[PDB]
């Protein structure tokens, strides 16, 4: 093989946008998309399809939930144990890359 | 949570081998003191780390007597397209400026 950027690592990436925007405040999956594609510039052409399985999975873990918002749009939020997931996900990354800063200033 | 440290654990060593190459035993004591004593890798999880590493051609070995390891130009590529790709994530939030 070679070089390329592995695919794992693009659903990751916008693993991590959906819940940025999530963290931002709740959503609709619609609003999400334009949302998304306007960050994106128009190069983050988000399908539904995706965002509803993505979600479906997000949940078993709680990671999410969900309520009902003539339309009734089906919203979003950021359960607090997602919070404390990616609040401490931030902190140990954060000693992460203070040990990467003192690898490199050491020689 | 488990993944989240093995990750981790593969930026802080491919970092150690991407400023150069480097030797398990040394490797473990200077991540010790970048650590400052927080991270206190074992040699069998390195061990584990780089077999999968060197299978994927991510790092190789050579005799230098101790095995030496070091980043291969297919792990510098690939460290330079994920800093390219993710900083491109990163300036696309950046979501809260078409907020408000």
């Known amino acids: 093989m070679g070089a390329e950027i592995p695919?794992?690592?693009?659903?990751?990436?916008?693993?991590?946008?959906?819940l940025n925007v999530l963290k931002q405040g709740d959503?609709?999956?619609?609003g999400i998309?334009?949302?998304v594609k306007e960050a994106s510039?128009?190069?983050?052409?988000?399908?539904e399809a995706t965002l509803y399985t993505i979600f479906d999975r997000l949940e078993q873990d709680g990671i999410i939930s969900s309520y009902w918002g003539g339309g009734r749009r089906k919203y979003y939020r950021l359960t607090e144990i997602g919070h404390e997931n990616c609040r401490l996900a931030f902190e140990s990354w954060s000693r992460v890359d203070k040990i990467i800063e003192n690898l490199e200033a050491n020689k």
């Open 27 to 30: 959503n609709y999956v619609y």
């Open 41 to 47: 510039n128009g190069e983050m052409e988000l399908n």
């Open 33 to 35: 998309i334009k949302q």
């Open 7 to 18: 695919k794992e690592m693009l659903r990751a990436q916008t693993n991590v946008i959906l």
